[PDB]
């Protein structure tokens, strides 16, 4: 149980570091909208190729 608490707190620190990295992009509109436009236009291009096929 004691060594499992040390493993648990280490993985909780990874989840807090992951949340802090996600917050560095939260409300950062330029990178956030760039990633959204890249994903949206990639799906629309794949569907345009599927409609052409």
């Amino acid at each position: 149980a004691t060594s499992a608490f040390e493993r648990m707190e280490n993985k909780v620190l990874d989840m807090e570091a992951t949340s802090q990295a996600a917050g560095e992009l939260a409300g950062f509109g330029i990178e956030n909208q760039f990633a959204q436009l890249e994903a949206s236009s990639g799906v629309e291009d794949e569907l345009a190729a599927l409609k052409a096929s």
Binding site: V12, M15, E16, A17, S19, Q20, G23
Partner: protein
């Protein structure tokens, strides 16, 4: 008290000394490193409150999946026919859903 006059003259001396030194480029480079150190320490404090948010959210997920495993244990007790184990599994669900609601209230 007597120390007061020594305070006035040392305050005048250090103001003369700094005033003789001060320049636009030095205050600009100091002001950007000051705001960088303030910003990185304050973002580390936000990373601690985010870590407590994700800690309490993963605790809520662990209790809510454990509560469904006590419903699985209650179903298994009912197919075994063991009423005392089915009733204990209901009491486990009732208490563990109360701790889940406590974690959900803290997370809110």
């Amino acid at each position: 008290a007597l120390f007061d006059r020594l305070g006035r003259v040392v305050r005048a001396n250090l103001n003369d000394l700094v005033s003789k030194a001060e320049d636009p480029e030095k205050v600009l480079e100091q002001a950007v490193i000051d705001m960088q150190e303030d910003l990185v320490q304050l973002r580390q404090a936000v990373a601690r409150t985010i870590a407590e948010e994700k800690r309490t959210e993963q605790r809520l997920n662990q209790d809510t999946q454990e509560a469904k495993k006590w419903e699985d244990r209650a179903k298994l007790a009912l197919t075994n026919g063991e009423e005392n184990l089915a009733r204990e599994a209901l009491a486990r669900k009732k208490s563990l859903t109360d701790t889940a609601a406590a974690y959900q209230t803290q997370l809110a």
